[PDB]
Amino acid sequence: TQNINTVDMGLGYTSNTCVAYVNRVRTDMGVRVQDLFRVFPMNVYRHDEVDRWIRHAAGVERPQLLDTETISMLTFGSMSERNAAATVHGQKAACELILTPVTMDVNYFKIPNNPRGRASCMLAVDPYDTEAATKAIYDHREADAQTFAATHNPWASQAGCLSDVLYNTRHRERLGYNSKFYSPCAQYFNTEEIIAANKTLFKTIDEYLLRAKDCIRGDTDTQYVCVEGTEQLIENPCRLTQEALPILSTTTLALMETKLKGGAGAFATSETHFGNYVVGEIIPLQQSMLFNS
Amino acid sequence: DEVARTDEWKGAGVSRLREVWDVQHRVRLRVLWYVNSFWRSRELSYDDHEVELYRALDAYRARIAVEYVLIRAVRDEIYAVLRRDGGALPQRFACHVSRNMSWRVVWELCRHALALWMDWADVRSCIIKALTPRLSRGAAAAAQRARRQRERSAPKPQELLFGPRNESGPPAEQTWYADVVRCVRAQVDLGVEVRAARCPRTGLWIVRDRRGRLRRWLSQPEVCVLYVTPDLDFYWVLPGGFAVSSRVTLHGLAQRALRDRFQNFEAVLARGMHVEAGRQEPETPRVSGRRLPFD
Amino acid sequence: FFFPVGLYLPEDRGYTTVESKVKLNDTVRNALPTTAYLLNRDRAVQKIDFVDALKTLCHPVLHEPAPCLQTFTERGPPSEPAMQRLLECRFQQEPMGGAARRIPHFYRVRREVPRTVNEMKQDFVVTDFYKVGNITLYTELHPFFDFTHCQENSETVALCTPRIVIGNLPDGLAPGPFHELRTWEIMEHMRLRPPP
Amino acid sequence: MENWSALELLPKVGIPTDFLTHVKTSAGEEMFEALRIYYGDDPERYNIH
Amino acid sequence: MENWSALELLPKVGIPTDFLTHVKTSAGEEMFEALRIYYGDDPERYNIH
Amino acid sequence: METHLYSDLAFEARFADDEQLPLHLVLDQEVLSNEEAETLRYVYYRNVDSAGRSTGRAPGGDEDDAPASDDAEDAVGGDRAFDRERRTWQRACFRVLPRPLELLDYLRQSGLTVTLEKEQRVRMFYAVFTTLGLRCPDNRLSGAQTLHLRLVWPDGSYRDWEFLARDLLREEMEAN
Amino acid sequence: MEANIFCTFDHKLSIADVGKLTKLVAAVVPIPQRLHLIKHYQLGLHQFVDHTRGYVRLRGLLRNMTLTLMRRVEGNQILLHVPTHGLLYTVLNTGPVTWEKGDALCVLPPLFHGPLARENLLTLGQWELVLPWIVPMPLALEINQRLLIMGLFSLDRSYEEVKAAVQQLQTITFRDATFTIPDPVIDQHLLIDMKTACLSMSMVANLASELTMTYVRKLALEDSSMLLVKCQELLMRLDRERSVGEPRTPARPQHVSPDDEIARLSALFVMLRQLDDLIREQVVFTVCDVSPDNKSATCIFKG
Amino acid sequence: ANIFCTFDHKLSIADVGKLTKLVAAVVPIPQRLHLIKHYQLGLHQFVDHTRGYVRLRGLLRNMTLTLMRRVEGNQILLHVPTHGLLYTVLNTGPVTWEKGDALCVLPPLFHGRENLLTLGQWELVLPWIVPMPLALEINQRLLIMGLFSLDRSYEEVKAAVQQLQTITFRDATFTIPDPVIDQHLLIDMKTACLSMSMVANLASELTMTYVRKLALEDSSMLLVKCQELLMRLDRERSVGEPRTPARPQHVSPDDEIARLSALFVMLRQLDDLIREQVVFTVCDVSPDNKSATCIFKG
Amino acid sequence: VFALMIPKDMYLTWEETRGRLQYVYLIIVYDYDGPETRPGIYVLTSSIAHWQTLVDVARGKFARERCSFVNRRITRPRQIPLCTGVIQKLGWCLADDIHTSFLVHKELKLSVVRLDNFSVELGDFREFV
Amino acid sequence: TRCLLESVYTASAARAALQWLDLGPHLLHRRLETLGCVKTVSLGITSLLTCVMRGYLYNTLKTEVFALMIPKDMYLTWEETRGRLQYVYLIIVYDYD
C-alpha cells in the first residue's frame, strides 16, 4: 500500500477538459415505454376482475410485495425486470411519458426546454434565497422566466400535478416504489434537490464536477441505478442547465422520407404541413456525428 | 377421534339472510343466522306485550328530545331576557355605527333571523359543541383549579422576591362556537369555531377566524350571530355589535340523559399507539383495497 | 431528449411550407395525428403509438388523485384579493319534495349568484389559457379530475370530483374543433366518411 | 477557525497572483474555504497571548 | 483537554515523589485537578498525527 | 367469517355470567363509506331495556337521575358520572373486507354451506363483519329491548344507531 | 471471507475528531452489511434511529446487523475488524452498565440513563455516531421480559390506569444504577410475539398433567414457608376472584403412569423452551477479565 | 491457554500415581485464573447436605471447563480448550460412548469411591460426561420423581417411583438416587417443582383473557383453535363442580401485573432445567472405549 | 470448501432479490390435516442470519400448519403432537455462486441446484411451534 | 425573549429592582438616569464596572474597539437607505390602556 497526497498550486482553475470525440451509443435511442407496474409493484385495482382484465390487456403480470425494512437493509435494490433473450440495440432507453393538453404550443418542443413546462434553472435565482427559488419554480401567478407565460403544461408545472406526484421522489417514497429503477424525469421534478442546489457560482461548479452526476449500470438491458462503486459516474450537462434537448421527430412518414432524401443539414430544420410537423434535432447528432466514426 | 367445533360449524352453514333497519330508518344492515350456533340449544322465551313497546317508544322519544329541549331553553331564555330589559340592549362587540341608519328594518331582520334559527337549529349547533367538552373527565378538576387560581390573594413581597415564578393567568384569546344565520338567502351555519379576544382600547369583543382573519359579519345587515362560550354564556348578536346576553341553563335535563347521549369517547390501547401518553402518533394503521395486504 | 406525440395544431391559423415537396391523400388519419416517428440507434425508422403507452397509462397511480387533493388542501386558499371571487360558491342539498312549487320562490328574491370556477374556465381562448391572466390555473391539476374551493359551514373547503367524460375538459385544453375532428376520425373508422 | 493573526504576523513569500476573475468576485462567489475580509486597518493582530 | 500522549513521549525530569497518602487514595479522593489513569499498556501514544 | 365463529365460541363460554347471546351482522356501503370502513378502529354496543335503562347501570337507578346543576366546578357529576357512563359500553370484534365482493359467493368460497329460502345475490363494495351481544337475563327476551351500535374512528369521532329487538328477531324467534 | 473492513469518512476530520476516534479504539460498532468498503454514513445506529417509531423496531434492526471492532484510525480511514468465533479479544464498554467477571453479554439499543446528559461522540454536521449498549444477560433478559409484560398488560386498557403501572414498569435498577426503557409502542413485532406467547401458554395449560397441577396445593396443605406463602397469596386471590370455594383438598391419584408423565413433561419442556426464546437474547461475548476502572474487558467472541 | 494448579498439602507417590490416571479428564474451575490452589479443583467446593442435583447443575453452567496435562512433581497443568478444535478426553461416565454422540456434563450421581484422591477432608470429584439422551432422560426422571414425593403412601406410586429409578442405556443398567430423603425433599428440588406447578396453574388461568385481548385486535383461525381448546379444558376440568367457572372481566391492574410478573419469574427458574448443555462431539473412540477424541463445542 | 447439490423441488427462497451473502437452512414442516402426517422437506436460502427473525418469518409463511398442529392436538387428545417444524442451519455462500444445473446418473436426468463454493457451518436441530 | 431573560435574572437584587420600578406612581423615565456604556468586569460578591460617558469603547492599548449591544426587539429604524452618519436615541413611550 502506498498513499498519495496532492496539493493544488493554483489560485484559479488550473486544468480544463473538453468532450472531443464520441464513438458509440450505449442505449438504443428507442421508443419503448417505461413499465410503471414494475416501479410501483404494490398497487392493484380495487375490483379484482378489472385488475385481471387490465393486466391482461397490457403486458404486465401479477403484483408483488415490496420487501421489508430488514431485508432492504441486508440486500440491494430489487432488479425486478429480467434481461431479454437477445440484445441487438444495446441498453433500453425507457421513455417516460408526461400527459399534456392537445393544445400545448408546438414551438415549445423546437428548442431546449424543461419538459415540465416551466423553467427551473437555479443559476437565475439568487443564491440561498429559498423563497425566491420556490416562487420561481412553483408560483403560477409569477411569469415563467423562460417564456413569460404562466406555464405550457398545467398538468406538470405546479405542486400537486399528476406528473409531480408521479415523478417527484418525495411523492414516490410516499406511494412506495422500487428505487432501483432509473428515472429520466427525476432530475426535473425533484423540487427539494433543485432548491438545495441554489448556491453561489463556484460552489455550483464544484457540485457539478463532484456530485451532480448520473450513474447507471452498464451491464443490463434496463437502466438500473448503479452501486456507487466500480462504476464511474456519468457527466450529465442537462442536470446543470435543467433542460432537455429536442430530437428529430416527425408526424408522418412523408416528412421522414423527405428528411432522408435530402442532403446534409436536412435534419436540422423544422417544417410544418397543416396538421403535420417535423421538429429538427438541435445538434447534428443523428445525421453525422454517430456515423462519421 | 373427535370432531372439532369449527368443522361442524362450517358444514352446518347458514340458513337466513335478513335486512334490518334502525328505528329511525336511516341505516340498513344484514343479519346472518348460523344453524350451529349455541343460541339454538337454550330454552329461550320471547314476548312483546304492547305496553312494554309503548313505554320503550316513549323512552326513545325522550332520548331524542335532549338536544331540542336545550335549544328551546336557549330561545325562551332569549325572549325572557329581552322582555326583562324592555328591548334596550347594549353594544358588546366592536363595530362602528351611524345614527342615520334606519334601525327599525334591522330590528325586523333580527326577528326574521330568530325565526329562521329556531327553524334550522340541530344537534350540531354551537350549544352542543360548546357543552360537550364539559362532560370530559378532566373538566371538573380543571374548573376547581381555575377557581382556586382566580381568587387567590395578592402576593406578598417575600414570594415576589424569592422562590417560584408568578402563577400565570388565563390566556387572553378564547375559543368559542357560533351559529350564523343569514336571511337574504336562507342559510344557517351551525357550530362554527371562532376565536374571541377583548379589545384593549374599549373592552368590547373581537372575533376572528381560526386562521387569524377578522370575521366581518357584524358589518352585514342581513345576518345575526349566536355565540356560546365554554363558560356557557351566550350572546345573540345583531349587526352593529348590540347583543342579548344570558347563560345557557341546562338544569331542565337529568344528568344521565345528557351524559349518555353525548359524553365524549375515550380510546383504549391498540396497535400503533404509544404506551406512554401524549406521544406523537405514527401513521394510522389503515387497511386498504388499493394495495396488496401485508402479511 | 424530449419529443411530443398527439398534438393538435390550431386549424384557424394552419399553414404549410412544403406544399411543393409532399402530398397527402385526403383522409382523417392524415389530418389528425396519433403517431410519432423517430430514428433508431442505426438510422432506421421506428414508431410509437398510444397502444404502446398502456404499460404506463393503465397503472392505477395515474387515476388516483388523493395526493393531488392532499397537496391542494395543505396549501390554503389564495390570499390575493383579485383571486377571492373564485372562493365564493356554496352548494346545498335540499329535499326534492316540493321542488317544482318552490322554483318560483327561488327567483322571488332578486339576488345574483356567484359564478362557478368551472364555468369561468370556458371563456379563455386557446392561447391565453396559459397566460398569467388565467386565474383558474391553480385548480387545473389533473386531466381526469376537477378541483375547486367552496364555502361550507362558513369555512373554505376544497372539493375534488372526477370528470366522467372527455367532454368535460376545459375548452382551452380541448376545444370544440378538436372534438369535431375526432368525431370525423371515429366516423372514418366506422366507414361513415361520407355519412348517410 | 484558521489563525489569521499568525498569517498576518509571520513572514511570507511573495508571488504574482493569477486569479482568472476579479479577486472580490472569487471571494464573493466562494471559490475558497476559510475566507476572511476586512477593510482599513484591523488592530486585532497586535494582541498576542 | 490535556493531551497525555505528549507527556508520555517527551523527555521527563526524574523526581522523588512524595504523596503523604497512597497514590491511588489521593487520586480516588479527587486531590488533583485533572487526572488520567490506565492499566496495562495503552497504544494511544504511538499514533502520532 | 372467522370473527363470527370466534365470537360465537366466546359468547358460549361467557353465557353463564353475561346472559348475552350472539348476533352476527354484516355492514356495507349502506351504513358506512369506503374511507370510514378502511379507517375503522373500534365497534361498541350497548343494551337498553324496555324502560330505557342501560344494562351497565344499577338496577334501582343512580345519582345520575338527578338534574344537572349548571356549575362549572361540578361539571356534571364529572368523574364519577363519566366512569358510570363509559362502563355501559362493550367492545366487539370486527374484520374489514376492503374490496368489492358478492356475499353468498364469498361465504361459499370459505368452508360454509349456504342454503337460503331465496338465493338472491347481494353485491357490496366492502364488508365489515362484527358480532354483537343481546342480553336475555331471565332466559326471556322482550321485543321492546333496544340495542345500540357505535363505530369509532382514529380521531375519536363516532356514529350511533339503535335497533329494537322486534325488528331483529320477529320471525326468527317465532321459528324457534 | 472479509475480515478487515475499510470505512471512509466523507467529511473532513479535525484534530479533535481524530483524537476522539483514537480514544474509541476497540469499541463495538454494528454494520448493516459485511462489505469490503463502506461510507461513514453506514456506521452505528444513527441511520436507523427514529423516535415515535418505537424500541422493538430498533431492537430487531440491531439484531440483524453485523458487529465489528474498531482500530487504526489512520487519517480519514478507519479499519473495522470482524471477530471470529471462539477467539479472545479485548472489548471496550462505552455504556454506564457495570460489567463483572464471568457473565455473558448481549447487544441492545441504548436505554435512557439517569443524568439526562448523554453527551455526543463524534458529530459530523448532521451525522452522529451512536453505539449500542453491550449489556450482561440478566439485564437484557429483564428488559425483554418487561417489554413483553407491558405489551400484554396495556392492550384494551385506558391511558389513565396504565399510566402508573407503565411508569413503574419502565424503570430498571441493575447493580446500583437506574435505567428507563425509552419508547415502548404496541407494534406488529410485539403483537406477533404476544400471539406466540398466547399459543405457548394455551399448549402449556392443555398439556399439564393432574399431579403437576396439584403439586402446589399439596405443599400448601403440608408445608408452610415464606416462599409458599407468597405463591399461595396469588393462587388464593385468583380462586377468590373466581368463586367463594374454600381450598379443596386434592384426591387420591387415579391413574399413575410414569411413561405418560415423562412424555407429557417432554412436551411441556418443548413449549417452555419456545416461550423462553421470546425473551432470551443472543450471547455475543463471554467475559473473563475486567479492568478495575470498568472501562474494558477481555472477552471470548461468540457468533 | 495454560492454567497452573498447586498442591499445598503433602502428596505421596501413591497420590501422584492415582492422579496421573486422570490425564485427560474434564476438570471444572470456578473462574479462569493463571495460578490456582488445589482446593478449587472439581465440585468438592459446592457439596453440602442441604443442596443436591439442581444446585450443582446450575453451578456447573457458569463454571469454566479445562482438560488435564501430565504432572510435575507437585503442580498440575490444565488446558482451556478452544472452540472448534479436537482433543482427547477421558470417559468418566457410567456408559459407553460411540461415534457421533453429543456429550453433556452432569454432576455425579454416585461413585464407584474406588479411586478418590483425598487430602484431608478434600477430595477430587469430577462431573459425568454422558450422551445427550441419557442426560435428558435422567433429568426429567428426577423431576417427575420429585413431584411424586408428596404422596408416596400409596403402593402404586411406590411401584411407579421404583420403575422410575431404574434406567437402561444401550447395554448398561444402573439406579438413580431418590431425591427424597427421610420423607422430605431438598430446597432446590422443591423450588423447581413449585415453579413448574405454578407456571402450569398460572397459564391455565391467564390464557383465556389474553386470547380475548389478542382476538380483539385480529381474529385469525389460530385464536379460534386456542379458544376451542381452552373451552374444552375448562369443560373437562369443571366436570366435578356445579354451575360455571365464572371468569370475570374487570380485573384490577395490580393483580394483572403481579400475575404476569409471577408467571415470568417462575419461567426464569426452569431455564436451567429445560436445556441441556452440550459441549463435545466424539469423532473417534478407542477400542478400549475408556477414552475418545472429541470436538469442543464450548 | 465443497459444493452442495439440491433438487429443484426441495429448493425455495422467500426474498426475490438475493443479498450478496446467503445463508442456507434445512426446514421440515409437519402437516396434520390428513389422517396421517405429511412432513414437507425444504432447503431454504436467505440473507437472514439471526435465527429468531427467520423463525418469525417462517411462522408467517406456515400459519396453516400451526393451525393444523393445534387441530391435531384437539382432535386426538390421547396423542401428543411433536411440533410444527424444525429448522437447522448448515452453510453460507454468495449469490453469484448459486447456479441451476442438470444431473445424469443411472441414465435418469435430474434438474438440480448447486452452491458452487459452499462452506459448511452446521447448527442445531431447533424446533418451533 | 421575555421568558428567556426573565429566567436569566433570577436573583434577589434583580427582582428588587423590578418591584421598585413598578411600585411607585411616577412614570418610568422619571426614575431613570443614563450613565453610558460599560467595558470591563471584575467579578465578586460585589462586582466593579467601568463605564465610559464620552468617547469610544476600547481596551487598555486600543488594540480592540467594543460595540454597543441592543436587544433585537428594541431596535428601531425608520429609513430605507441609511445616511452615512447615524445618530442613536433612546425612546420610552407610554400606552394609556
Numbering used by the authors:
A (entry chain K): 1078 to 1370
B (entry chain G): 298 to 592
C (entry chain K): 393 to 588
D (entry chain H), E (entry chain L): 1 to 49
F (entry chain G): 1 to 176
G (entry chain U): 4 to 306
H (entry chain V): 6 to 117, 121 to 306
I (entry chain T): 162 to 290
Publication excerpt:
Composed of a diverse array of proteins, the tegument is an amorphous aggregate sandwiched between herpesviruses’ icosahedral capsid and outer envelope. While tegument proteins in general are well-differentiated to carry out highly host-specific viral functions, tegument proteins related to the capsid vertex-specific component (CVSC) have in recent years been identified as key players mediating critical functions universal to all herpesviruses. These include in HCMV the CVSC proteins pUL77 [pUL25 in herpes simplex virus 1 (HSV-1)] and pUL48 (HSV-1 pUL36; also called large tegument protein), as well as pUL48’s non–CVSC-binding partner, pUL47 (HSV-1 pUL37; also called inner tegument protein). We resolve atomic structures of portal vertex-associated tegument (PVAT) and identify multiple configurations of PVAT arising from layered reorganization of pUL77, pUL48 (large tegument protein), and pUL47 (inner tegument protein) assemblies. Analyses show that pUL77 seals the last-packaged viral genome end through electrostatic interactions, pUL77 and pUL48 harbor a head–linker–capsid-binding motif conducive to PVAT reconfiguration, and pUL47/48 dimers form 45-nm-long filaments extending from the portal vertex.
Notably, across all PVAT types and in both virion and NIEP reconstructions, penton-associated tegument densities demonstrate biased occupancy toward the more portal-proximal CVSC-binding-registers of penton vertices [there are five possible CVSC-binding-registers per vertex (43, 46)]. Similar to the portal-proximal Ta triplex, penton-proximal CVSC-bound Ta triplex here exhibits the same 120° counterclockwise rotation relative to non–CVSC-bound Ta triplexes that has been previously documented. However, we noted an additional conformation change in the first ~160 residues of triplex protein Tri1 (HCMV pUL46) in penton-proximal CVSC-bound Ta triplex that has not been seen in Tri1 of portal-proximal Ta triplex nor any other Tri1 position or homolog to our knowledge. Each dual-lobed density satisfactorily fits a model of PVAT pUL47/48 dimer without any morphing of the dimer, although the penton-distal dimer has visibly weaker density. Rigid-body docking both pUL47/48 dimers with penton CVSC en bloc into a global portal-resolved capsid reconstruction shows that portal-proximal tegument densities above northern tropic penton vertices fit two adjacent CVSC complements whereas those of southern tropic penton vertices easily fit one CVSC complement. Nonetheless, prior granular analyses consistently show that the most common penton vertices are permutations with two adjacent CVSCs bound and one CVSC bound, mirroring the tegumentation we observe at portal-proximal CVSC-binding-registers in northern tropic and southern tropic penton vertices, respectively.
